[PDB]
Design a protein around this ligand. Structure first.
Ligand SMILES: N#Cc1nn(-c2c(Cl)cc(C(F)(F)F)cc2Cl)c(N)c1[S@@](=O)C(F)(F)F
Length: 271
């Protein structure tokens, strides 16, 4: 029960997701793996908040399985950074392809495109990982890869992990996940955006379509206020993004790891 423009909107967003999101992670390869003075206390706190074991199912049926070390006050806490930087770079490329395919994004001036991508790449990445997150086992299932949280109520103290469990509980459709990505991408208040009036009108239209979609396709009392919960999710995710951008820059300051694409998105110039 949407306007013709509203369903053309969902159709195009659902199309750009289909073309740019490798849900089986088939083309993620050549990645790195762990081998076979008051900043550090913060960096140690930054790192220990999301430790994860890693499983690789080979095409032949073999299984590699990695258990990370415990914190012993040394550089061994940096063991997973190259791999997770390689995974982030792969996700970021899918995000950039996603935005480039959308006509509303394409139509913005280029300098506004980079500004919007710098501001929302993390958030769109987190949103895509939620669709492959298994809340019953605490595992991100990325095709032949899987990432299982180490052994509960004290794990939800981490805001990002708390975000993933709450978003998964909302039981969202594919159409609702992609409208969330559009709203986060077309945020008029990212640093450096110039066409903020255009970008705000675009954002307001993606939110209105989402509100109408829920009310057309979700009449159950369980989904009362669902639109407002999602919009609050997005504000929460957005705060998680800011506070994590500093986590990453702190680690980068004392132990470099960011790929060239990660530097581009986060403002590191090379000197
Ligand atoms: N952005 C994005 C982003 N995705 N991820 C992420 C990765 Cl790489 C892997 C998993 C896995 F399932 F594999 F465990 C889960 C997640 Cl949520 C992380 N750590 C980030 S950020 O910290 C960064 F580094 F800035 F990209």
């Amino acid at each position: 029960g949407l306007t013709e423009e509203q369903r053309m909107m969902i159709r195009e967003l659902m199309d750009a997701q289909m073309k740019t999101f490798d849900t089986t992670f088939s083309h993620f390869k050549n990645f790195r793996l762990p081998g076979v003075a008051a900043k550090w206390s913060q960096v140690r706190k930054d790192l220990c908040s999301l430790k994860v074991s890693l499983q690789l199912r080979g095409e032949d049926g073999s299984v590699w399985n990695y258990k990370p070390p415990a914190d012993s006050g040394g550089k061994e806490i940096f063991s997973l950074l190259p791999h997770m930087a390689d995974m982030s770079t792969y996700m970021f490329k899918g995000i950039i392809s996603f935005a480039k395919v959308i006509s509303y994004f394409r139509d913005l001036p280029i300098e506004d495109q980079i500004s919007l991508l710098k501001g929302a790449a993390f958030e769109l990445c987190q949103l895509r990982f939620n669709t492959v997150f298994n809340a019953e086992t605490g595992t991100w299932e990325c095709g032949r890869l899987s990432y299982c949280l180490e052994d509960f109520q004290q794990l939800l103290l981490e805001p990002m992990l708390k975000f993933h469990y709450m978003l998964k509980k909302l039981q969202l459709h594919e159409e609702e996940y992609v409208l969330m990505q559009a709203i986060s991408l077309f945020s008029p208040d990212r640093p450096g955006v110039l066409q903020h009036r255009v970008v705000d009108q675009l954002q307001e239209q993606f939110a209105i379509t989402l509100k109408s979609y829920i009310e057309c396709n979700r009449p159950q009392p369980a989904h009362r206020f669902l639109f407002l919960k999602i919009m609050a999710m997005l504000t929460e995710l957005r705060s998680i993004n800011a506070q994590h951008t500093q986590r990453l820059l702190r680690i980068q300051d004392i132990h470099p790891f960011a790929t060239p694409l990660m530097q581009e998105l986060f403002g590191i110039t090379g000197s």
